Enzyme design. Structure first.
Site, PDB file in Angstrom:
ATOM      1  CB  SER A   1      -5.552  -7.640   7.246  1.00 33.02           C
ATOM      2  OG  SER A   1      -4.025  -7.214   7.271  1.00 33.02           O
TER       3      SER A   1
ATOM      4  CE  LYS B   1      -4.953  -4.181   5.859  1.00 33.12           C
ATOM      5  NZ  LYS B   1      -4.973  -4.847   4.321  1.00 33.12           N
TER       6      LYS B   1
ATOM      7  CB  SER C   1      -2.110  -8.123   4.163  1.00 35.96           C
ATOM      8  OG  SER C   1      -3.384  -8.023   3.594  1.00 35.96           O
TER       9      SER C   1
END
EC number: 3.4.16.4
Length: 352
Positions: free
Chosen positions: A107, A44, A41
């Site tokens: 997320s 991101k 993640s």
């Protein structure tokens, strides 16, 4: 011995890490910092960076409505399974504000797809932009393939590179960065909390950044905190649990504020030195820096910092252009040069 001591680094339960000063760029501590790992993640953070750059250029705003399409349909794409999702459905019209908060706080993976198409037209094109900023930032060990971090065998990053991306976020896109400290947002009746637990840690001033995990990646966290004044960024990658990635980052940031401090000895345009000029419309050149000077030094040692300079040439001959490099400033502690910066002409000196 006490004045000159170099502090020991705590043991960090993680595959890699780095700790850097945000202002100076100094690496205070690092382990396996350029090793290529699955960023999960933390990808991101680049998605958010691209979106922040687009908003900065004024291409869209937070109030603008994004109509959700089929690629961003959460339960229309089993790629999203087990992952964090806003549960976007095609047809929905969602303000950018709520989609970037789905990205940053939650997320949300479906949110990334919706913002990607909106911002760049397709995910492939947006991913091109992600990697374009990988190049522009000069990152040596990062490549993106997806807008979320899912479904990417050839994606990679590093503790160093992820910390640099953190810096870029804070520095380049500050309106976008301040969303990361928000502990909760509401979407579709449902209150969603920020995944970064350290925001709730009362002993520190954490205000970002991003969290991440796979059974591949282990547990990843990029964190940033302030004391002052001083801002530090940590990236820990391949930590062992959720609890976990937070506890280990805490050790680094606390250690950093305890033993190191950030000084700003010289600003842009302020005169550090004066030198005679030949052939010019004035007698002397005003000398300094084209970038604010920030240094990270052992805490306590501010009163011991000595600055001096050298010149590249024997004489200065006009014409001299603004920010023309003409030497080097040496910052010293204990008789030794710890940092250097270019010495520049602050004001152009035209020929007589």
């Amino acid at each position: 011995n006490i004045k000159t001591m170099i502090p020991g680094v705590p043991q960090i339960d993680a595959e890699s890490y780095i700790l850097i000063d945000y202002n100076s760029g100094k690496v205070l501590a690092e382990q396996n910092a350029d090793v290529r790992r699955d960023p999960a993640s933390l990808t991101k953070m680049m998605t958010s960076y691209v979106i922040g750059q687009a908003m900065k250029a004024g291409k869209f705003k937070e109030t603008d409505l994004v109509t959700i399409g089929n690629d961003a349909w959460a339960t229309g794409n089993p790629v999203f399974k087990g992952s964090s999702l806003m549960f976007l459905k095609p047809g929905m019209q969602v303000p950018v504000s709520q989609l970037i908060r789905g990205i940053n706080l939650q997320s949300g993976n479906d949110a990334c797809v919706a913002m990607a198409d909106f911002a760049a037209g397709s995910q492939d094109a947006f991913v091109g932009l992600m990697n374009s900023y990988v190049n522009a930032l000069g990152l040596k060990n990062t490549h993106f393939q997806t807008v979320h971090g899912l479904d990417a065998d050839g994606q990679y990053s590093s503790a160093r590179d992820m910390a640099l991306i953190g810096q870029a976020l804070i520095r380049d896109v500050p309106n976008e960065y301040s969303i990361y400290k928000e502990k909760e947002f509401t979407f579709n009746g449902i209150r969603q909390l920020n995944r970064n637990g350290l925001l709730w840690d009362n002993s520190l001033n954490v205000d970002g950044i991003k969290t991440g995990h796979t059974d591949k990646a282990g547990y990843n966290l990029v964190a940033s905190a302030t004391e002052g004044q001083m801002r530090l960024i940590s990236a820990v990658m391949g930590g062992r649990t959720f609890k976990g990635r937070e506890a280990e980052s805490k050790k680094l940031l606390t250690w950093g504020f305890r033993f190191f401090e950030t000084v700003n000895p010289l600003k842009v345009g302020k005169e550090f030195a004066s030198e005679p000029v030949w052939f010019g419309d004035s007698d002397r050149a005003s000398l300094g820096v084209d970038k604010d000077v920030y240094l990270t030094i052992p805490r306590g040692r501010m009163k011991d910092l000595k600055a001096s300079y050298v010149l590249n040439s024997s004489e200065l001959h006009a014409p001299l252009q603004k920010n023309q490099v003409v030497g080097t400033i040496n910052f010293q502690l204990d008789g030794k040069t710890i940092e250097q910066r270019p010495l520049v002409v602050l004001q152009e000196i035209p020929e007589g």
